[PDB]
Amino acid sequence: KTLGEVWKRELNLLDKRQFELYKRTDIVEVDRDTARRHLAEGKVDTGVAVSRGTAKLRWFHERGYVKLEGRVIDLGCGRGGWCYYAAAQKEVSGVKGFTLGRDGHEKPMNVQSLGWNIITFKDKTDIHRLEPVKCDTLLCDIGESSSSSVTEGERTVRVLDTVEKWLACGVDNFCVKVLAPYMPDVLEKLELLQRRFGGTVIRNPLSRNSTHEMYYVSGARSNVTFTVNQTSRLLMRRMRRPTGKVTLEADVILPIGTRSV
Ligand SMILES: Nc1nc2c(ncn2[C@@H]2O[C@H](COP(=O)(O)OP(=O)(O)OP(=O)(O)O)[C@@H](O)[C@H]2O)c(=O)[nH]1
Ligand SMILES: Nc1ncnc2c1ncn2[C@@H]1O[C@H](CSCC[C@H](N)C(=O)O)[C@@H](O)[C@H]1O
Numbered sequence: 524k525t526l527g528e529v530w531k532r533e534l535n536l537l538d539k540r541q542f543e544l545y546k547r548t549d550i551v552e553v554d555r556d557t558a559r560r561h562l563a564e565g566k567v568d569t570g571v572a573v574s575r576g577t578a579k580l581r582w583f584h585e586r587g588y589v590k591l592e593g594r595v596i597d598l599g600c601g602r603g604g605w606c607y608y609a610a611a612q613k614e615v616s617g618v619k620g621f622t623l624g625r626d627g628h629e630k631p632m633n634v635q636s637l638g639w640n641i642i643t644f645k646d647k648t649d650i651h652r653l654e655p656v657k658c659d660t661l662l663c664d665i666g667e668s669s670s671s672s673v674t675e676g677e678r679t680v681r682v683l684d685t686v687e688k689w690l691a692c693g694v695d696n697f698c699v700k701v702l703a704p705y706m707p708d709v710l711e712k713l714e715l716l717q718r719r720f721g722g723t724v725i726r727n728p729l730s731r732n733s734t735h736e737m738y739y740v741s742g743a744r745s746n747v748t749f750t751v752n753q754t755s756r757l758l759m760r761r762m763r764r765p766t767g768k769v770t771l772e773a774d775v776i777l778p779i780g781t782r783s784v
Contacts, residue, residue: 526755527705527735531672533762534733544767546733553578553729553774562632570777573632576604576664577775579729580698584608588725588742589698591615593659596689598650601629603642605662610638611777615660618642621650636777651685661686661694666702668734676706683712683739690720697722699739704751713739713747723747726754732761 537545558571572578583589592614597606600620610618615638624630624646631644650665665682669675679702686699697720703709704724713724716739723745724737737754 525705525707525710526752526759527703528672530705530735530755530759530762531675531703533759535670537762541765542733544765545762546731547769548732548761548764548766549768549770550731551728551770551772554771555774558774562634567634568779570636570779571634572604572636572775572777573602573607573634574604575729575774576601577608577777578772579664579727580605580608580662581775582727582729583698583725583738583740583742584612588738588740589660589662590696590742591660592696593617594657595619595660595662596656596658597621598653598661598663598686598689599623599665600631600644601664602632603644605664606631606642606644607634607636607639607777608775609660609662610642610782611636612638616641619656619658620644621648621653622646623649635781636779638782640781640783651681655689655692657692658689658694660696661689661699662697663699666700666736668702672703672706675703676708679703679706679709680712683709683716686739687716690716694720695741697739697741701737701739703735704737704747705735705755710748710751717744717747724750726750726757732758 561569561571591609591612595609595618597620600622606620722741726737
């Protein structure tokens with residue numbers, strides 16, 4: 524009965540065209556033209572991002588929502604957009620990325636943007652059964668959308684449940700995707716996590732309107748119920764005023780090469 528649950532129900536009632544228009548209404552997105560061309564040509568030394576995820580993490584990082592320091596672990600790294608972004612930061616000493624990379628799941632992409640040499644990619648890995656390892660910065664960008672709010676809730680609670688095992692090891696920084704923060708059980712788990720590890724949930728402006736995803740981050744503290752409902756209100760307002768109006772921003776270009784010595 525949360526506003527977010529109402530949003531989800533109304534989202535599914537939209538006809539095909541209503542939905543397409545709604546999804547990009549007033550959203551911000553990076554121009555991926557150059558990156559796509561470079562990757563298609565096999566270029567590995569131009570600094571382009573392997574996915575839209577790089578710009579997503581940059582947004583949190585550049586405004587202090589998450590500090591990227593020391594030993595970084597990236598659960599559900601996919602192509603590696605977050606791993607490459609983290610590897611290029613002076614404060615980061617090493618990056619370990621884990622992902623399924625099988626049966627349709629994206630495999631890590633190998634490019635040589637700054638610090639590629641300090642990244643250790645590991646595919647064929649289900650992070651829910653991966654024994655926690657000590658790190659300083661914990662990242663996780665997992666959460667598969669579902670037309671069912673109940674299913675999105677189940678998937679979100681499972682991610683938070685697994686991530687809590689890792690946070691329990693003692694981590695200074697974190698940025699974790701929360702697919703369905705609007706679900707009651709999820710809100711409560713977040714409130715419990717906040718009392719245990721601090722942080723709060725923040726909506727990334729690069730997220731599309733078809734998902735209510737928000738990220739649990741260590742760099743801010745605020746009432747989770749309030750902020751999640753603020754996002755529900757914004758998503759609902761956009762559905763009542765469809766325009767498809769998008770604002771393009773420059774994609775991230777990282778320096779290149781190894782970090783040595
Ligand atoms: N009414 C309606 N809802 C849809 C349609 N397609 C998807 N949705 C809804 O939109 C939600 C968002 O899913 P998507 O954006 O399509 O996929 P995603 O994996 O979350 O992200 P993308 O990979 O960028 O598409 C889904 O969970 C559905 O509830 C459609 O054709 N009509
Ligand atoms: N249980 C699991 N274990 C490991 N990886 C998983 C997983 N469930 C989903 N994934 C992977 O998590 C990834 C989420 S998309 C991550 C994008 C990444 N942040 C970037 O910037 O490129 C997908 O590749 C998905 O295959």
